Amino acid sequence: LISQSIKNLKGGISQQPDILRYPDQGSRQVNGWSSETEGLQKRPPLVFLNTLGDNGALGQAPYIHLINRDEHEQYYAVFTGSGIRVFDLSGNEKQVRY
Amino acid sequence: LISQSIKNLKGGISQQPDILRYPDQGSRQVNGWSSETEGLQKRPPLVF
Amino acid sequence: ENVQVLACQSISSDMYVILRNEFNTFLARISFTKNAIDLQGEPYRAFMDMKIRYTIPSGTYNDDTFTTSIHIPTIYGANFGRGKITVLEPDGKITVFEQPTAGWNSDPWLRLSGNLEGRMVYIGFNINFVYEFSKFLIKQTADDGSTSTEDIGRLQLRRAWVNYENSGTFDIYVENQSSNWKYTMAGARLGSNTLRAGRLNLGTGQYRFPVVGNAKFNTVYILSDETTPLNIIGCGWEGNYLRRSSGI
Amino acid sequence: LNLGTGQYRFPVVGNAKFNTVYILSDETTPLNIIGCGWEGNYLRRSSGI
Amino acid sequence: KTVLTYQLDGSNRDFNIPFEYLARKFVVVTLIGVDRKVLTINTDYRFATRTTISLTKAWGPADGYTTIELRRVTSTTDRLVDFTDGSILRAYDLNVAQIQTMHVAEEARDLTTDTIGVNNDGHLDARGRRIVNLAN
Amino acid sequence: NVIKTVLTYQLDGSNRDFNIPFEYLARKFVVVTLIGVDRKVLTINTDYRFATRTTISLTKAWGPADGYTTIELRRVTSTTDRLVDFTDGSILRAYDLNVAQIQTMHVAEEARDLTTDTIGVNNDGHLDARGRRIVNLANAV
Amino acid sequence: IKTVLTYQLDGSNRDFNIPFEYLARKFVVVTLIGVDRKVLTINTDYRFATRTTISLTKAWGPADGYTTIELRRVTSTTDRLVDFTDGSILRAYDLNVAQIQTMHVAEEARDLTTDTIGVNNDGHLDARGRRIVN
Amino acid sequence: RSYDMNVETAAELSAVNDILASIGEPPVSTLEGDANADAANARRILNKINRQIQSRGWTFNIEEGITLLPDVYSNLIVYSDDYLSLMSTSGQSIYVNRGGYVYDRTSQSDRFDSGITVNIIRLRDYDEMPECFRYWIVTKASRQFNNRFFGAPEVEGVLQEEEDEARRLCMEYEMDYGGYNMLDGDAFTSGLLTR
Amino acid sequence: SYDMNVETAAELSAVNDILASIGEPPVSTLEGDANADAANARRILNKINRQIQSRGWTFNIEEGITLLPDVYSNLIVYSDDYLSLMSTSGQSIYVNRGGYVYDRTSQSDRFDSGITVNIIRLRDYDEMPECFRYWIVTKASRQFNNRFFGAPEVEGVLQEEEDEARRLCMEYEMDYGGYNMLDGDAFTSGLLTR
Amino acid sequence: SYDMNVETAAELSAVNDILASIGEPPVSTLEGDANADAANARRILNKINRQIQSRGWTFNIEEGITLLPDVYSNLIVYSDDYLSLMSTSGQSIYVNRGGYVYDRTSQSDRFDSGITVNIIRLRDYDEMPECFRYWIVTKASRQFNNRFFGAPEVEGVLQEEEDEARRLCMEYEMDYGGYNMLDGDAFTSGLLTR
């Protein structure tokens, strides 16, 4: 009769064979956050801020960059590929003249 | 009665004597690809 | 299921995510705050995706069917393709609505049971947590850090334990080749100063559950879709080990 | 396709020094070899060192 | 008191209900009549207050439908409470969980008094009826 | 069938101890009545005591003489007042849930008591009037 | 709807189906009424072929003297399926099983009407055969 | 809390608790559902041993002269799995089961007209058993569930002694209960003492 | 099986002594606070209380008591409090089938007017001689020390105590019963008549 | 050898108990899903089923049964279901040569009109007394615990169980056969004639 204990669950998915994985690693970890103090938790929940329009509004592949210039000047800028749509972090569109 | 297990087959050919080879090494490996995740596989095929 | 994720970028300890649906795109926020209630007045942090706090509009309740119904597009501004939506009242009451088969875009309405017209309901989809465990082999560290596992013997496993702290509603499924058993840790133990009628059931402890069989063929996964939190500190196992060929 | 995962235990019998094992495949299907074990009686008479 | 007949003469809409019920769907209203008729809810009877139902039109003795007999049929399959993993328990939850079963039992014990039943004296009172098919 | 909460044990002479098999939830929920020509319910300490957890000992011993052919000990669990009722901040104790669940089961077993009250079938294929008079009853045709 | 149902017995039918949502299994009792009540044991004579059928082994009939297979569900008041215990997680499956069992007892309490004397056309009380006793 | 409460419990459920107390783990609340393995295994080892303790014939178990009856149409009497033993009343039992039907080995007939009389050990449940045995069915199940799953040798070595004490008490139970007599109650030497 | 939903101060000192057996501090009330060990101790005390009464003892075996059938039912409830029904003379004929006494021999569950049976019935722990009250604890002090805290050296001392307790218990009735070989039995009392 | 290609619910509970013997979870069906352990358990149950029947037991040994030769062939098939053909009185003369009964003494494989032989024939596990049905499992519970999961401490307890099972089995026929020394045999029944 033998027993073993994995002290912490800090490692995430490992695709190495099971005979080679370290004790912490596991096969699947979805929607989880492996903190050091409490080993595994559920990810913090998404909180809805705003809806930014239809699916194609931002385009199939936008390049989105965050302009963190100041505490009050945090803005997101998306490049639709057809134009620029800038969003305040509260979700409010900021007009971009061209 | 003793048993031993070579955990991985990552090393390739070794021409050193058998009494000196490390456990992973082997005498011949032709058309094989020793990946870390799956130890030995067949080489990917040539595509014309 | 269908949420195409545009590039999130963390600002401080808060991550701002942009998603597609594909009916309407949104900006959402993830913040790793240990002890906060993400929305105002919410009874406990509810780990539900897309949390919104909606004060119900007056026109919704109908006396004849005795239901109060809220349109999903009105609540979020967008119709959603799939998912289970939990509506949490200010009190602990939770009503979970599974997706209409067509989607939540065919029929949007969430038909809450009572007459709620001035209540504030925190509505959101459910996050699904899945953590499979690596197979329970005997892993012995070498003199060096690398760990090697003894696979040269039969390890028949008899029990296993998950040590948790302040967590709830988790289900641990042990599946042998043909068995599929599920064991649920549901909260504080009866009689604890923690289990109370109106408070969240969050408890600390070790849940010992039986995993029986060859280690090589047994799989354990922990799955939780509930609104409550989860913590997993450690995991043990015991079991008979008998390698006949005394190695090395 | 018949592709499977497992341990195939096969009998290799005899002095280790004179036994050779080779794996040969010319088939269209893939191959993976993770580890290899062996067991066997060991008896050194002269208890060394 | 799951059953009580409210024999009313005119188109009287108001009929108070004294059996506390768990939901609207449990109180079923029929008019005692030459033929008993189950009046549907939205179309025919509406709950003015939880306590009082209020019928539309109300039929009558002049009509074939006569007296109105409302009663409680508390469903035994559709459980009002479904305990799930927290989901904070609610005091209101456990108490209602037990009240539904107490209600089913209490209204089922009146499906006997409609027959022979027992008077306070302790005697099984036939209501002046004739026992047929008996053997000596 | 059979009825497990109403038991009537014959009365002869000085047998003054009768046993209560049914699981009763409180000492006030068992009613002991001396059925005979006139039913007489007996009071908790003046007449019947509860010798053990499951035995009732009558003080006087009543026989066929005073009327009183049989004694019926039956269970009456109060449907109105719940023995334990949860509140918002209460610690949930395995005793409270247990007493609560045990009371509803008891109320439904009182439906077998309802079979005992009305005329209902006994072990034999015989409708049983269980020692009570069929009052009223009309006439013969 | 409905806990107590009776079938008809002919010599060669042995499979009868059970409508009610029985918890456990010990809870269904199968008594061959016939001329004289006779209870069937769990495996010697009748056996639960599917969750929803009770298949007799002997295939009784009137030739044996028994008609009208009566298979009714009697929930047990004493043998509770859930016993809460201190120090054990309050799982929701437990509370729900407790509530389901007590509501099953009450549901069968609602069937005693099928059990009693019975009212014929008019108010006539009826006793079909069944000589009143005591 | 009232002293005046007599409330009961599942004698079957309390037996499965005693098994899980023995191996060492917290009491499991409800046996229902085929998810928990420990309950299913502890319940099955309870059932699989219930059919052994009963199979060994004891005086109460052995019904005597029970008349099994043939089906009118096929004249064959079924041998169930609840019939732990079926043996002739007197000696040299002639009944065996062939294809699940009582067969008379001596006359080679599966067809019986009018019935057979035999000593059946019927299989009955934990709750119809004498307390003496209800202890011993559990504490024998408390060994094999300790054997097959929690193989620590030191507590099986403790528990063995208990199963043996239980056997001694169980045996004492019927030597009283059967009340068997050498010289006044048997078949042979009751007849010799007639004056 | 009767289950434990009531409390007693004299019984509370027994569960304290079963928690002493591991090395645990005494509880103060058996309220239901999540003390797994105390709960388990109450379980082992009750589970062993129903052995010590089951082994028949002289004060335990009520002799020649009449169980009365319920008049309308015509059957007698054979409850789980009746540890051993037996019979008064020989070849006891009563067995539990369902929950009711059944005459094994006459194949009848129906009785009119009762039975003289020798019944050993459950009595509370408190309603027990002090000699046994020690031994019910110190036998429970073994199995509770074997099922949760499996240390061998604190058990091997305890087993030597359980036996002493049993000796003292046995000594208790051989006085209390007062059993006479040649002047008090059924056979060789009749032979000594002059 | 008859091989296992059919299933039975009463037999399924036996393979569950052989998988309990290692410490494995119960199977639910013996479909053929790759459960090596269940397959091996079915093999050991069948392989030991053909011992317990082979050791002759009273209900197993059909006595005086007649095997009939096929009329045109003139030989009798001696199949693998016949565990022990023997003969009725002494010096059994029938042996299996090829697949047919051969008279060892008269050197003939050809028979006309049959033979009275005492045959022990294979019967299913289900067609077995409950006393043996336990012991066929708990003997298979040893060899399956010796061939795949070779732990010594869970075997040494099991061997002490196999023996108890054998005792109980042996007790079963010494009642069931009802064998009489001085009133029922062939020799000393004849001596007691007055």
> What gap in Å lies between CA G80 and CA G92, rounded to an integer?
16
Q: Are E96 and E80 in contact (CB under 8 A)?
A: yes
- Give the HSE-up count for residue A42: Cα atoms under 13 Å, Cβ half-sphere: 26
Alpha helices in D1-49 (DSSP H): none
CB atoms within 10 A of CB H168: 11
C92: three-class secondary structure by DSSP: coil
Phi first, then psi, for residue F114 (nearest 5°) are -60, -40
Q: Flag whether residue C202 sits within 8 Å of chain G, measured between CB atoms.
A: no
Q: Are C15 and A47 in contact (CB under 8 A)?
A: no
Inter-axis angle of helices H131-148 and H37-53, nearest 10: 130
Which chain C residues have a beta carbon less than 8 Å from that of J151? 240, 242
> What gap in Å lies between CA F30 and CA F23, rounded to an integer?
10
| H56 token code pair | 């060994």
> What gap in Å lies between CA F5 and CA F111, rounded to an integer?
10
Q: Are E66 and E6 in contact (CB under 8 A)?
A: no
CA angle J34–J39–J45, rounded 5-degree value: 165
Which chain H residues have a beta carbon less than 8 Å from that of I98? 128
| J38 token code pair | 């269940």
CB burial of A58-75 (b: ≥16 within 10 Å; e: otherwise) equals bbeebebebeeeeeeebb
Phi-psi region of H41 (alpha: psi -120 to 50; beta: other; left: phi over 0): alpha
> What gap in Å lies between CA B39 and CA B36, rounded to an integer?
6
Contact F129 E124 (CB under 8 A): yes
Which chain D residues have a beta carbon less than 8 Å from that of C151? 35, 37
Contact C152 D35 (CB under 8 A): no
| C37 token code pair | 């209630």
> What gap in Å lies between CA G92 and CA H21, rounded to an integer?
23
Q: How far apart are the first and last CA of chain J?
A: 52
Q: Are C109 and C60 in contact (CB under 8 A)?
A: no
CA distances to I34, I133, I134, J51 from I10, rounded to whole Å, are 22, 10, 12, 59
| J32 token code pair | 């053929």
DSSP-assigned letter for residue J55: S
Nearest to F86 by CA among E87, H38, C199: C199
Q: Are G101 and G75 in contact (CB under 8 A)?
A: yes
Which chain J residues have a beta carbon less than 8 Å from that of C246? none
Q: Flag whether residue E104 sits within 8 Å of chain G, measured between CB atoms.
A: yes
> What gap in Å lies between CA F5 and CA H55, rounded to an integer?
35
Contact H1 F95 (CB under 8 A): yes
**Cross-chain CB nearest to B41 (options D30, D36, D37):** D30
Q: Which chains touch F (3 or more CB pairs under 8 A)?
A: C, E, G, H, I
Find the residue in C nearest to F90 (Cα): C196
How far D1 CA lies from chain B's nearest CA (Å)?
17
Phi first, then psi, for residue F13 (nearest 5°) are -140, -70
I157: three-class secondary structure by DSSP: helix
Dihedral (CA of E128, E134, F3, F5) sign = positive
Say how many residues make up chain D. Answer: 49
Contact C51 A46 (CB under 8 A): yes
One-letter amino acid identity for G20?
A: F
Q: Are A51 and C75 in contact (CB under 8 A)?
A: no
Q: Are I72 and I36 in contact (CB under 8 A)?
A: no
Would you list which residues of chain D are within 8 Å, Cβ to Cβ, of chain C? 35, 37, 39
For residue D34, list its beta bridge partners.
none
| J152 token code pair | 């010594």
Which chain F residues have a beta carbon less than 8 Å from that of C191? 91-94
Nearest to C189 by CA among I33, H189, G111, A38: I33
- Give the HSE-up count for residue H167: Cα atoms under 13 Å, Cβ half-sphere: 10
What kind and span of H or E run contains C76?
helix C72-76
Q: Which chains touch C (3 or more CB pairs under 8 A)?
A: A, B, D, E, F, G, H, I, J
Phi first, then psi, for residue J77 (nearest 5°) are -70, 125
Q: Which of residues 80-109 of H touch I (CB under 8 A)?
A: none
Which chain H residues have a beta carbon less than 8 Å from that of F19? none
Phi-psi region of I192 (alpha: psi -120 to 50; beta: other; left: phi over 0): alpha
DSSP G40-99: PPTTTTEEEEETTEEEESS---GGGT---EEEEE---SSS-S----TTSB--HHHHHHHH
> What gap in Å lies between CA E54 and CA E46, rounded to an integer?
5
CA distances to C44, C229, I94 from C93, rounded to whole Å, are 12, 17, 55
- Give the HSE-up count for residue C79: Cα atoms under 13 Å, Cβ half-sphere: 12
Which chain B residues have a beta carbon less than 8 Å from that of A20? 7-8
> What gap in Å lies between CA E107 and CA E4, rounded to an integer?
12
Contact C234 A9 (CB under 8 A): yes
> What gap in Å lies between CA I45 and CA I144, rounded to an integer?
9
Is there a cis peptide before residue I162, judged by omega within 30 degrees of 0? no
Quote the distance between the C-alpha of residue A5 and its chain's center. Answer: 31
Q: What is the resolution of this structure in A?
A: 3.4
| C188 token code pair | 């504080």
For residue C237, list its beta bridge partners.
A4, C160
Q: How far apart are the first and last CA of chain C?
A: 51
Q: Flag whether residue G132 sits within 8 Å of chain C, measured between CB atoms.
A: no
Do the chains F and D touch each other, judged by at least 3 C-beta pairs below 8 angstroms? no
Which chain D residues have a beta carbon less than 8 Å from that of A20? 34
Nearest to F75 by CA among F18, F1, F129, F22: F22
> What gap in Å lies between CA G92 and CA E89, rounded to an integer?
10
**Cross-chain CB nearest to G116 (options F98, F119, F130):** F119
DSSP chain E: --EEEE--SSS--EEE--S--S-TTTEEEEE-SSS-EEE-HHHHEEESSSSEEEESS---SSSTT-SEEEEE---SSS-S----SSS---HHHHHHHHHHHHHHHHHHTTTTTTSS-B-TTS-EE--S---BS---
Residue tagged 């090589």 (tokens): C216
| H176 token code pair | 């009283």
Which chain C residues have a beta carbon less than 8 Å from that of D35? 151
Phi-psi region of G65 (alpha: psi -120 to 50; beta: other; left: phi over 0): left
* Backbone break loci in chain G, preceding residues, C–N > 2.5 A: none
CB burial of G9-45 (b: ≥16 within 10 Å; e: otherwise) equals beeeebebebebebbeeebbebbbebeeeeebebebb
I170: three-class secondary structure by DSSP: helix
Quote the distance between the C-alpha of residue E63 and its chain's center. Answer: 23
3-state class percentages of chain C: helix first, strand second, coil last, to nearest 5: 5, 50, 50
Nearest to I34 by CA among C189, C185, H1: C189
Cβ neighbours of residue J35 closer than 8 Å, sequence gap 6 or more: C177, C178, J27
Q: Are G90 and C201 in contact (CB under 8 A)?
A: yes
| B28 token code pair | 């011949």
Contact B9 D36 (CB under 8 A): yes
Cβ neighbours of residue J82 closer than 8 Å, sequence gap 6 or more: J119, J120, J121, J122
Contact F26 H8 (CB under 8 A): no
Residue tagged 């100041």 (tokens): A70
Q: Which chains touch D (3 or more CB pairs under 8 A)?
A: A, B, C
Q: How far apart are the first and last CA of chain D?
A: 53
Contact G82 H32 (CB under 8 A): yes
CA distances to I41, I180, I186, I191 from I183, rounded to whole Å, are 45, 6, 9, 10
Nearest to H51 by CA among I81, J59, J10, I85: J10
Q: Flag whether residue G53 sits within 8 Å of chain E, measured between CB atoms.
A: no
CA angle H88–H89–H91, rounded 5-degree value: 70
Q: Flag whether residue F109 sits within 8 Å of chain G, measured between CB atoms.
A: yes
Q: Are C123 and C83 in contact (CB under 8 A)?
A: no
Q: Flag whether residue C192 sits within 8 Å of chain F, measured between CB atoms.
A: yes
Contact C158 H35 (CB under 8 A): no
How far G79 CA lies from chain C's nearest CA (Å)?
22
| G85 token code pair | 């215990």
Determine how β-strand E124-125 pairs with β-strand F134-135.
parallel
CB atoms within 10 A of CB F50: 18
CB atoms within 10 A of CB D2: 4
Dihedral (CA of I23, I27, I30, I31) sign = negative
Which chain F residues have a beta carbon less than 8 Å from that of H4? 26-27, 50, 53
Which chain G residues have a beta carbon less than 8 Å from that of H17? 85
Phi first, then psi, for residue A33 (nearest 5°) are -125, 115
CA angle I177–I179–I182, rounded 5-degree value: 165
> Which long-range contacts does J175-183 make (Cβ < 8 Å, 24+ apart)?
J175/H57, J175/H87, J176/H85, J176/H87, J176/H93, J176/J58, J176/J59, J176/J129, J177/H92, J177/H93, J177/J58, J178/H90, J178/H91, J178/H92, J178/H93, J180/H91
What's the per-residue H, E or C state across J78-147? CCCCEEECCCCCCCCCEEEECCEEEECCCCECCCCCCEEEEEEECCCCCCCCHHHHHHHHHHHHHHHHHH
Inter-axis angle of helices H37-53 and J130-147, nearest 10: 130
C138: three-class secondary structure by DSSP: strand
Q: Which chains touch E (3 or more CB pairs under 8 A)?
A: C, F, G
Nearest to F52 by CA among I2, H2, H10, H6: H6
CA angle E130–E132–F1, rounded 5-degree value: 105
Determine how β-strand J115-121 pairs with β-strand J82-84.
antiparallel
Cβ neighbours of residue C63 closer than 8 Å, sequence gap 6 or more: C115, E46, E47
Cβ neighbours of residue G64 closer than 8 Å, sequence gap 6 or more: G34, H71, H72
Q: Are F138 and F118 in contact (CB under 8 A)?
A: no
CB atoms within 10 A of CB I97: 17
Contact G64 H72 (CB under 8 A): yes
Q: Flag whether residue G83 sits within 8 Å of chain C, measured between CB atoms.
A: no
How far C244 CA lies from chain H's nearest CA (Å)?
17
Find the residue in H nearest to F53 (Cα): H6
Q: Are C184 and C225 in contact (CB under 8 A)?
A: no
Which chain F residues have a beta carbon less than 8 Å from that of H1? 95
Nearest to H134 by CA among H12, H9, H6, H48: H12
J23 burial (CB, 10 Å; 0-12 / 13-18 / 19+) is buried
- Give the HSE-up count for residue F132: Cα atoms under 13 Å, Cβ half-sphere: 28
Which chain H residues have a beta carbon less than 8 Å from that of A3? none
Q: Flag whether residue J166 sits within 8 Å of chain H, measured between CB atoms.
A: no
Quote the distance between the C-alpha of residue H83 and its chain's center. Answer: 11
Say how many residues make up chain J. Answer: 194
> What gap in Å lies between CA F121 and CA B31, rounded to an integer?
87
